[PDB]
Amino acid sequence: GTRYAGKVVVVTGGGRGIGAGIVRAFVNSGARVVICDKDESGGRALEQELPGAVFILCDVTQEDDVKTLVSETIRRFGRLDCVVNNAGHHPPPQRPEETSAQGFRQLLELNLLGTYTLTKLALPYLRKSQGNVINISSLVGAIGQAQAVPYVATKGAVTAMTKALALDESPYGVRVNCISPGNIWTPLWEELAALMPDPRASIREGMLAQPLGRMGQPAEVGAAAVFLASEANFCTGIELLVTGGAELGYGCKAS
Amino acid sequence: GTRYAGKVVVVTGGGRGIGAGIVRAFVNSGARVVICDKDESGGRALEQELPGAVFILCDVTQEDDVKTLVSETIRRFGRLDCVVNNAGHHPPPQRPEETSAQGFRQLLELNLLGTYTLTKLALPYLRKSQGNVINISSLVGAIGQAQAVPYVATKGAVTAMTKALALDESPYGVRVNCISPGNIWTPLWEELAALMPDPRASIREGMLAQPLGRMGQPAEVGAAAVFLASEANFCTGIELLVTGGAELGY
Amino acid sequence: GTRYAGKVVVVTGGGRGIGAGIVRAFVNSGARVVICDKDESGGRALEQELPGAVFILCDVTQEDDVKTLVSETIRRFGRLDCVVNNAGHHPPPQRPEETSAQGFRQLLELNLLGTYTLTKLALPYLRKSQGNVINISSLVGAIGQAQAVPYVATKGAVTAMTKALALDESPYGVRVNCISPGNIWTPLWEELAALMPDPRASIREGMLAQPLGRMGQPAEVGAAAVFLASEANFCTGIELLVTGGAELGY
Amino acid sequence: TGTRYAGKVVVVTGGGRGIGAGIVRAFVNSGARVVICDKDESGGRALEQELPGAVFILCDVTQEDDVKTLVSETIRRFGRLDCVVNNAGHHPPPQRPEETSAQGFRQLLELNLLGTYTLTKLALPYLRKSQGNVINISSLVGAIGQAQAVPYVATKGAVTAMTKALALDESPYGVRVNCISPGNIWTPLWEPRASIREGMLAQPLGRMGQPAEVGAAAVFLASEANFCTGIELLVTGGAELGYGCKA
Structure with a gap:
């Protein structure tokens, strides 16, 4: 309740899944949290549950x-210390032939340009506070993924942008880092699995993609974010992997 | 003269600079090369010089x-073996505040979605030839650079996409690789340098920015591409760094 | 206070510098800490100041x-939750011609095989507690450094070995991670700087070697270690960089 | 024979079979003079008989x-040294960490790391004169790890890292130093049926690699990668890509 006391944190896509986990982690650290989501219902239930948190409806x-969003934050709390750009969408699986440029553009809006925009607008305030930026990218940005060309491109862009911005903002004492989760069990993961012919088999396959033999928890991503914000003071431009070792060793990559 | 003989290669952004180095390299391999560019003046001059190269006006x-373009390439040559996605622009230095979303979107159109569009359309024919894709990314996508947020983002996206696509195309035996150059000398560079407050100083900086103590040549990028096309048959989803050691602890 | 309470931590090379920063960080977490080192003078001093810390003379x-050491730790504390392998020496700068195989072997003995031996002997106990291993590597292992071939090689080995071990230990739920520091300030550094031809210039050079414009602190490495031990439950085989941005396009 | 590396002199350690033999052939086909360096007489002697552009020198690194x-004999016979390919190295059988020993680990560092260090050190004066290059054969597992191979993995992480440090040291002399990191390459070493299959399917390409493919990559690094130093060239069939079966 004290690790990030007196700090003001914006978490986009914060109403559910990974975002909600991050939101909870920061609230437990004693931070004031602005939940930013386009979905009313999720973020409003979360704001009721957690007094350390406030819901602002927003499409990035x-x-x-x-x-x-930014003006409201400063108006209500007078400062901004951390921006966590978690807003983002994983499409269902799609072969490259069955993607479109328009779909790809739309997904760049959702996954990259929102991050860009909030970060740009927040940065003046993050300089004043010597705050920090945390982008939620994905492992698949680094190693790729089958049937996800647009998604993978958007997350490689986020991770790369994180490094560029780290370099630009380091003169101002603003650290810019990313977290790259692997397979995190969320309702999102579950809806996707439900689309498969044998969803149970697909969930299993997802568990076994980690050497740890399980998928990750939104709380675990949240812990990583609170660390980056509150204690990683000599870290900037890093990619913190929360993947259960999924990138490690040989596996089953064909059939 | 023999290494990629009887093969058909499309090089986007092939009219000059790095792209022209790639075209030349493939022509010297024996390949038929389609220069695909909006730069007609470069492209037609290359085509006139190199019998193995032809120019098709095309904005990706x-x-x-x-x-x-793809339809003409097939109609004319009957096959497509290799696509080099080299089209792309590096903007001048820009601080993050002085970028716009609009500018960023435009750069994504050129650097990322152009690569997407051509690869998508070429892929049915690459499958038939068991061909390959070579995307020209940039070292800065991997390690960042100052005053280049949109650019770095677009190249990190191309490198990532390379890997995604390698995965999807592997069952068809179509390989998908990228080359990430560092500081490569071009006639444009040389011309810009001469406008500097101190051109000699600027030139030295550029040469000493990597351990090898010089800048790269377009031909070196080309050689890398020809290797990937012609002899790197167990390579897919790799990022081949052509940087002079720029990313090393230096 | 409370977040690694009830847990038993062995820190090798914990008597001073980076190691002492890790020890203190764990002590402040509420853990019982066994300082394992050949540096008695540092180790005994830390033990006397920190009630939660104990010193055992041990050459890894x-x-x-x-x-x-391991047997004393178990017999005294009944458990072992975390092993931090921080023992290791950075030699002075040496050109490759001036290294010897014998030197290299000795440095492997300390930096690599010391880590191996302890981890091997602890693992049966870590499995019981579902504990974890934290190896302190170095950024130079990832990107290289001039005039440090043996040292770079040993750290590259440690980072690679971390991943190997993470795989092997994953079925038992034992996590194995590494922290790769860049330039971290220590009293020894400060004492060496003072001997330089121009200490001010030397100090500046060290501060400006990373984009954050200062050197790191032992405490920061310690914070990262406590995070890995106590809250990074889905992290195994990662390399956590504590470098101030040193590896960026900088 | 070939023109690409004509007039050049190349030393390939562990050159008598498997991957080393593929590298040797690739270089002989490029028109290079190749010194096959191996501790095994039989393999390298058969290969030197087969390939006139090649010479066998018995040597334990x-x-x-x-x-x-080895170095003195190369210079005495051919007057120059243009490329050293450090391919000598051993993959032990699969071993749990508890069943490894320190002594075993030290032995493997001698075989996989210190031999490379030693030859490279002795060769470097000549490599400077020729503006030659060094190519170390590491492994993908150095970078991503492997199960039941702690010592081996450590040795290859060491090789890859050393490559980078040396590249930095030798760049002022114009000597490039790169490595190739092979994944699963089909050799008699590699060579149950179920395990072979699982090895094939560890690559998205659905097959294992061939020594000739590693050879091609070496010839490229030696002869045309003139603005490459300190790189890790992956010859892995995409094994590091995507999600797999890791539990």
Whole structure:
């Protein structure tokens, strides 16, 4: 309740799954948390549950929404210490032939340009506070993934952008890092699995993709974020892997 | 003269600079090369010089241009073995505050979605030839650079996409690789350098920015591409660094 | 206070510098800490200041010292939750011609095989507690460094070995990770700087060697270690960089 | 024979079979003079009989006098040294960490790490004169790990890292130093049926690699990668890519 006391944190896509885990972690650290999500229901239930938290309806692809989010934050709490860019969408599995450019553009809006926009607008305030930026990328940005060309591209862009921005903002004492989760068990993961012919088999396959033999927890991503914000003071431009070793060793990559 | 003989290669952004180095390299391998660019002046001059090269006017951001290019390449040469996605722009230095989302979107159109569009359209024919894709990314995608957030983002996206696609295309035996150059000398570079407050100083900085103590040549990028196309048959989803050691502890 | 309470931690090379920063960080977590080192003078001082810390004289290159350490730790504290392998020496700068195989072997003995031996002997106990291993590597292992071939090689080995071990230990739920520090300030560094031809310039050079514009602190490495031990439950075989951005396009 | 590396002199350690033999052939086909360096007489002697562009010198890279002689003999016979390919190395059988020993680990560092160090050290004066290059054969498992191979993995992480440090040291002299990191390469070493299959399917390409493919990569690094130093060239069939079966 004291590790990030007196700090103000914005978590986008914060209403459920990974975002919610991050939100909870930060609230437990004693931080004030602004839950930013386009979905009313999720973030509003979460704001009721957690007094350390406040829900602001916001679509990060809409610049005015982002502009308002930032102004509201400063207006209500007078400072901004951490921006966690977690807003993002994993599409269902799609072969490259069955992707479109329009779909790819849309996914870049959702996964990359929202991050860009909030970060740009937040940065003046993060300089004043010597705050920090945490982007939620994905392991698949680094190693790839089958049937996810657009998604993988968007997350490689996020991880790369993180490094560029780290370099630009280091003169101002603003650290910029990313977390790259692997397979994290969320309702999202579950809806996707439900689309498969044998969803149970697909969930198993997902568990066994980690040497640890399980998938990760939103709380575990949340812990990593609180660490990056509150104690990783000589870390900038790093990619913190929360994957259960899924990138390690030989596996089953063909059939 | 023999290494990639009887093969058909499309090089986007092939009209000059790095792209021209790649075209030349493939021509010297014996390949038929389609220079695909909006730079006609470069492209037609290369085509006039190199009998093995032909120029087709094409903007990769324009889907119908790219459909026509692929269709013409097949109609004319009957096959497609290799696509080199080299089209792309490095903007001037820009601090993050002085970037715009619009500018960023435009750069994604050129550097990322152009690569996507052509690869997508070429892939049915690459499968038939068991061909390969070579995307020209950049070291800065991997390690960052100052004053280049959009650019770095676009190249990190191309490198990542390379890997995704390698995975998807592996069952068809189509390999998908990228080359990430560092500081490569071009006639444009040389011309810009001469406008500097101190050109000699600027040139030295550029040469000493990697352990090898010089800048790269377009031919060196080309050689790397020819290797990937012609002899790297167990390589897929790799990022081949052509940087002079720039990323090393230096 | 509370977040690694009830747990038993062995820190090798814990008597001073980076090691002492890790010890203190764990002590402040509420853990019982066994300082394992050949540096008695540092180790006994730390033990006297920190009630949660205890010193056991142990050379990790000596297998029987290590067997004794582990056995004493168990017999005294009944458990072992975390092993931090921080023992290791960075030699002064040496050109490759000026290294010897014998030197290299000795440095492997300390930096690599010491880590191996302790981890091997602890693992049966770590399995029982579902504990974890934290090896302190170095950024230079990842990107290289001039005039440090043996040292770079040993750290590359430690980081690789971390991944190997993470795989092997994963079925038992034992996590194995590494922290790769860049330039971290220590009293020894400060004392060496003072001997330089120009200490001010030397100090500046060290501070400006990473984008954050200062050197790291032992405490920061300790914080990272406590995070890995206590809260990184889905992290295994990772390399956590504590470098201030040193490896970036900088 | 070939023109790409014509007039050049190349030393390939562990060159008598498997991957080393593929590297030797690739270089002989590039028009290079190749010194096959191996501790095994039979393999390298058969290969030198087969390939006129090639010469067999019996040598154990863990023995410094053998290495000293190898280098001196190369220079005495051919007057120059352009490329050293450090491919000598051993993969032990699969071993749980508890069943490894320190002594075993030290032995493997001699075989996989210190031999490379020693030859490279002795060769470097000549490599400077020729503006030659060094190519170390590491392994993918150095980078991503492997199960039941702690010592081996450590040795290869060491090789890859050393490559980078040396690249930095030798760049002022124009000597490039790169490594190749092979994944699963089909050799008689590699060579149950179920395990072979599992090895094939560890690559998205659905097959294992061939020594010739590692050879091609070496010839490229030697002869045309002139702005490459300190790189890790992956010849792995995409094994490091994507999700797999890791439990």
